[PDB]
Design a protein around this nucleic acid. Sequence first.
RNA 1: ACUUGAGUGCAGAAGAGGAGAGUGGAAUUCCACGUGUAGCGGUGAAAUGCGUAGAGAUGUGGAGGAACACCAGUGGCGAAGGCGACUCUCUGGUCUGUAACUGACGCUGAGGAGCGAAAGCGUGGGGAGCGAACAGGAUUAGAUACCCUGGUAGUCCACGCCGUAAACGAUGAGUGCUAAGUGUUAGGGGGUUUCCGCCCCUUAGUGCUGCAGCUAACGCAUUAAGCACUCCGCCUGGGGAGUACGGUCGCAAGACUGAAACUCAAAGGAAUUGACGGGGGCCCGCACAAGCGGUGGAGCAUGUGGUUUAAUUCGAAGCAACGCG
Lengths: 71, 165, 131
Amino acid sequence: RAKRRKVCYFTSNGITHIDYKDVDLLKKFVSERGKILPRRVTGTNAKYQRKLTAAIKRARQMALLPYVSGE
Amino acid sequence: RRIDPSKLELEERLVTVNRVAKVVKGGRRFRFAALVVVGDKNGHVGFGTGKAQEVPEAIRKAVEDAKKNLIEVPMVGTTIPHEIIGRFGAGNILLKPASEGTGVIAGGPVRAVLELAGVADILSKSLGSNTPINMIRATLQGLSELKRAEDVAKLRGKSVEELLG
Amino acid sequence: VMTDPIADMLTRIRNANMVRHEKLEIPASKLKREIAEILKREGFIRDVEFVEDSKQGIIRVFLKYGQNNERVITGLKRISKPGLRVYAKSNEVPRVLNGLGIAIISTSQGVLTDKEARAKQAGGEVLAYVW
RNA sequence: ACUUGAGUGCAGAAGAGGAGAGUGGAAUUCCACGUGUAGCGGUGAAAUGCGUAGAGAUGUGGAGGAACACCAGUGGCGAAGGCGACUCUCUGGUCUGUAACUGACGCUGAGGAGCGAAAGCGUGGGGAGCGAACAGGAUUAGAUACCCUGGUAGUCCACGCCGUAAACGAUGAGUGCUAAGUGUUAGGGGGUUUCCGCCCCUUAGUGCUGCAGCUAACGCAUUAAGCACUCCGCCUGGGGAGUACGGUCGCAAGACUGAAACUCAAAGGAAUUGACGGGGGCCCGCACAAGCGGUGGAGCAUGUGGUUUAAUUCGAAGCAACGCG
């Protein structure tokens, strides 16, 4: 009490990125098997999960992060 | 408030003693139910009753219901102060203020209630429900909401007998 | 919005009339003003003190009803509907309540009361009715 | 005349609001070739079907259509139906904030105009999955169904018509007021805070919990079904019957509008008590399971049914009538 663990994950040191030139926070965002991270277990905000999800897609379109992973 | 004690001569008219049966394993356990209203003949006229096994039992629980509650009904000499359409419970009552020799023209539960509760000329014709309990309910709320002129001058501070006619 | 002002004031004194609030607001207008002097002079509320300022408004009356539930504002009704107007002649100026309440017919010489308007003996638009 | 209403401005914020073009993967099918054998498949159990013409599986590559998993949530947006991969063009709208201007320029609104899921309808494209009608096999007494294996139209696209839905919150729109708490996005002001973060005030939108009040009860409750005002639409017992007849539109399919004669005293909403359940939960008993010994097979004893009689006396007929009175 009274907050979430991993408090907001982007609002402390953001904002407004990335997307294409970023592969670092994109490296810490797209999950281990290959999927996008859950917004309850990762801990982003509303607009934080929206921007990191849109930049996760738009950074997955130019072949930056993998469109599928291993098992 | 205040709860008037049983300290007068009660009239004890019976409104209606309805049948009732709880449909249980074996037919229907029939028990009488009567909502008969007792009246003081001056203004204490209260109307509630219960159930029991015999017809005299329903008389007994009904009389206990009359010793439960009583109402005031302030009305200056064969009238009420303001003839208000008083009904609560989906059953209306339209009781106006009538003249001296215009009689107590009311219905079943109205003629029982006002007929055993000191009425001289109060015209009443209902508009709404027709259950007995609904009639004594909306009639009891209407009789328990009509205002008296002296106290109506004594609580709204304009003047006593300043509103005459 | 703004369907009728007097119905907004009457709904104000009604809804606050059951809320048990100490003071009550209003939209300040000539009907709230003259109706505030009439309905305050007849002894329902404590005092209307029309605290005016830019741009418009704004009246502020206090409920003059004591411990006893339902004081001098015991129930109000729109006797005149702005949209289908009431009317009342001299002999047909009806005194609402019978002996308790009082009606306020907007006479041709000022917003009168019931008995005072019958004292002038001239009716007009039935402005409101406070049962 | 004036400014809060309503509008313009200025600055912010946000979104699967729309239309057009282009692009990207995961997966299924199909095809080509390698590898390999005797099963694959499906079910309650099977069968139809596929497989030694080499299937399934597995490896590689190619083609094509449709939908975009993770983020994703009683989240967002829209008038509603609805809207989801990603990018761009063109475009509408909402809310916040001071507050420059305008000065009531507003609310509703029968007709009229326009949009409206899915099924359909016309033409021309597209047909990978799914899949009415259809074929076969199964289950049943029967299976024009449930199940399985297949399979046409359709779903997809563009152009036009269709204009119905439980089109639902079964709640028309606008405005004002009226206890509180707790979430949740989109903002703003602030208290100290470089941070961050906590907390208050504030909007706007949306969810829960509940005061007053409403109510037939369930319930609603600042997103009211409260309290009042404006305006539109709808309702007058059920069946007959949204049927007939007449009109309007439709390519049709039909849509809108829409009666009547006869007949009945009930339909109906909520709530209660019991019953039921091949609904769930808990439990018990020769109930089942576990063992013993039987009956139904044989001759005989008694009773009943039946048939006969002059009469085969009357009473009992699921356990609870039948070695009963």
